[model samples]
Target: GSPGENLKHIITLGQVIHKRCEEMKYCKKQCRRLGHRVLGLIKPLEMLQDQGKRSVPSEKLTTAMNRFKAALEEANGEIEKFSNRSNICRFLTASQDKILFKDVNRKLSDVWKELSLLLQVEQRMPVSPISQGASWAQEDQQDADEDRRAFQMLRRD
Candidate 1:
């Protein structure tokens, strides 16, 4: 698959994790932390998404994208389960959710590390600031980055 396609899948799953985090109340703090972490990934994913659109190929990004896809899907399931406002069942298991979230955070941190490594590897050299060709294009990217950051700030709770 093209990196764009693969990244699309991962980004979609990432969005779900964010949505699930917002829906969470029982464990709002931790899930929101996780949500913010997921939110941070959007910039890089879209960068690669743009990179993928430009012809030539190296979906080595695919491996990492797939890895994140599975993790995000796994996180969605776990968060959905914990976020449900069900019966007395939750009260008994409330204490254990700390460990559960801890594990989730740990695994997600690992994903972030893996993601960071590949991002650096795949895009060792970003576009030059002075390049005349892509000045306007690059300006759009900068604007998008700022816009994305604005979304992150708004998402803060």
Candidate 2:
């Protein structure tokens, strides 16, 4: 139930993101492609490579997951309501249209907020040493060294 249901929830959230992509014409192409990439990256990373891999045991991730679940459920219910309607033109009256827009906007905002918070948490968390590959060139090497020094300082009391 967990994995499959989570995937469905992800799809529902994707619908909300796609809707915004359509409206935002300037960055639509880049946004759409990156959105698909992020979605696609998560699938194999979570399911295929390593099943049940809790590499980061931080509460930040846990809280983010919980917030996401609620947002997913909210979006799922709203989507289901729209899906059950047979006639898109006739069924969605002016009043219904206004209500629908408001609901969708709210859900999308919630999704963005939760996703941003999750990313903020991940940014502050430590990276796995295996994931940190060696940098090429002397300039790049110096930058990497500086970054490690700052990171180490943060880790120290």
Candidate 3:
């Protein structure tokens, strides 16, 4: 009974991983957008503070950061699950040299750093003017960056 148990477990885990990966990808996209929005406000705030204008309200930035952080937390939770699955699957079906559980771990570290940086900036924002257009544009840039990173990560594996 134990002879084929590992194979069956691997197959089942693989299917679950695949499904979870798809949904997590979508969640990651949403988090990317939220990060952009938070950054959108923060960036222009940076620019405005330099110009001696208070455009983005501190309260608004705080609120935006909260939402952004929550989304990231959710996405990261999914990623941790995926990474665990990947690690287990690798142990069951692949060689140790080829398994790349570390990639996801590194990416998670990067995102955590980015989110923390954004939060720090928001907390210390000098009174400044933040234009809606500037915020939106910054978010668009973030989305593009995220798209590239996501594809690149998959390609590397």
- lDDT (0 to 1) per candidate: 0.56, 0.40, 0.39
Model 3, 29-98: lDDT tens digits are 4344433333343343334334554334344334433443343344345455545545534443553322
TM-score of each: 0.61, 0.37, 0.24
lDDT of 1 by residue, 62-92 (tens): 6766777777788777656655556313742
lDDT of 2: 0.40
TM-score of 3: 0.24
Ranking by TM-score: 1, 2, 3
78 Cα displacement, candidate 2 (Å):
2.4
Candidate 2 lDDT for residue 103: 47
- After aligning candidate 1 to the native by TM-score, how far in Å is the CA of 137 from where it should be? 39
| Model 2 Cα lDDT, one tens digit per residue, 1-157 | 1344444444445555556545542222233432442343234224422345544434544454455546545533544444432432233454442223334334434544454545445544222222222321232333333433543465579
Q: Pick out the ten consecutive residues of candidate 3 with the lowest summed lDDT.
A: 1-10
User: What TM-score does model 2 achieve against the real structure?
Assistant: 0.37
Off by over 4 Å in 2: 1-54, 85-91, 98-101, 124-157
lDDT of 1 at 104: 55
